[PDB]
Amino acid sequence: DYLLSANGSKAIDFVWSNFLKHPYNPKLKQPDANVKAAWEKHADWEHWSNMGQDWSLNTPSGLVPRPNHGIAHTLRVAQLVPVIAEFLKAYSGDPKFQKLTQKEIQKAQYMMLFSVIGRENDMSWTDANHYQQAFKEAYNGQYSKHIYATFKENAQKGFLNHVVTNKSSLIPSLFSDESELQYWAEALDTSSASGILMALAHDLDLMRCYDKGKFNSLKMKDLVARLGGNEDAAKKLADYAHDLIVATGDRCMGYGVTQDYNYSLFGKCSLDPNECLKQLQSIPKPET
Numbered sequence: 001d002y003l004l005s006a007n008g009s010k011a012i013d014f015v016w017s018n019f020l021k022h023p024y025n026p027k028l029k030q031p032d033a034n035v036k037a038a039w040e041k042h043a044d045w046e047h048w049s050n051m052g053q054d055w056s057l058n059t060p061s062g063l064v065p066r067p068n069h070g071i072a073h074t075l076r077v078a079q080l081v082p083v084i085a086e087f088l089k090a091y092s093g094d095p096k097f098q099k100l101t102q103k104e105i106q107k108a109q110y111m112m113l114f115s116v117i118g119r120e121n122d123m124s125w126t127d128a129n130h131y132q133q134a135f136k137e138a139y140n141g142q143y144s145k146h147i148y149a150t151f152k153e154n155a156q157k158g159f160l161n162h163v164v165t166n167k168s169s170l171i172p173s174l175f176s177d178e179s180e181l182q183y184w185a186e187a188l189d190t191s192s193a194s195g196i197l198m199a200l201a202h203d204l205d206l207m208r209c210y211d212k213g214k215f216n217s218l219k220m221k222d223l224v225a226r227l228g229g230n231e232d233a234a235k236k237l238a239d240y241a242h243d244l245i246v247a248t249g250d251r252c253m254g255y256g257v258t259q260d261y262n263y264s265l266f267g268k269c270s271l272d273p274n275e276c277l278k279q280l281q282s283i284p285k286p287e288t
């Protein structure tokens with residue numbers, strides 16, 4: 001609903017045009033030879049080829065960049081926020097979440113829009129830990145900037161760039177004042193109701209790229225705990241996330257009726273934010 005607000009649509013246009021519609025950065029497709037050498041030594045370490053994974057996806061309506069962190073994902077995680085909030089209020093048995101007003105829900109939703117824009121490849125936090133440990137392992141302890149810190153700083157920069165010209169629109173309607181805006185700009189680099197809310201949106205959407213075992217263990221347990229041990233409420237929440245994924249033609253690997261990409265549908269949603277919203281809106285929200 002706030003995704004249809006003036007602030008909402010403007011943020012969407014901004015993150016899409018300035019970040020999400022662009023290819024990943026070729027300089028971050030792989031490490032160099034010396035870094036590669038250090039990486040392979042750990043047979044437990046997921047392969048450096050993870051740096052190049054989900055680079056782009058071929059689709060009837062065009063080549064889709066960053067298919068695992070593009071506009072479909074971004075809008076879905078934003079979409080989920082208000083529903084997650086409703087479920088937390090009903091089942092958590094935690095007062096913090098009854099402290100969750102619409103405005104705080106709206107801020108969380110808005111901020112989710114900026115949640116993946118800093119990405120320059122599809123590597124995980126773990127891959128980045130490994131890269132740095134191997135840039136080290138390779139060159140006698142020499143430091144290099146954590147790749148995820150760069151992603152965070154980029155996302156932060158994007159956000160500051162957008163809010164600078166939209167303050168009269170965003171304050172006081174969405175952000176109460178400039179210092180509240182400051183806190184959220186800071187939170188983008190680096191445990192509150194808002195954070196847990198946003199983390200759970202991220203968590204639920206990972207069903208798109210985690211297998212069932214990995215998704216159910218790494219992500220569903222944490223949601224189940226968040227909802228007062230109510231497994232059933234968690235499942236309904238997961239069903240809606242599933243349906244949003246299916247509505248956008250995305251792959252779903254970790255929950256429900258799994259599927260590969262619906263290429264036709266995903267190319268359409270991923271290359272037109274407006275089509276993506278329409279499809280997401282087509283899914284009935286679960287009742288609490």
Ligand SMILES: Nc1ncnc2c1ncn2[C@@H]1O[C@H](COP(=O)(O)OP(=O)(O)O)[C@@H](O)[C@H]1O
Pocket residue numbers: 069114115116117118119124125126148150151152153154155202
């Ligand atoms: N530790 C992690 N495990 C799994 N997925 C992650 C992890 N960290 C980030 N992600 C994925 O990366 C996305 C955020 O990327 P991030 O590096 O924060 O980009 P940006 O800094 O531009 O927001 C999230 O949507 C999430 O799906």
Ligand SMILES: Nc1ncnc2c1ncn2[C@@H]1O[C@H](COP(=O)(O)OP(=O)(O)O)[C@@H](O)[C@H]1O
Pocket residue numbers: 096097099179180183184191192193194
């Ligand atoms: N688990 C929680 N649930 C809800 N609110 C929390 C939780 N933990 C801390 N908080 C409070 O929520 C606020 C989050 O920051 P923010 O929304 O920017 O505050 P403000 O709206 O006053 O600027 C913090 O002031 C903190 O006291």
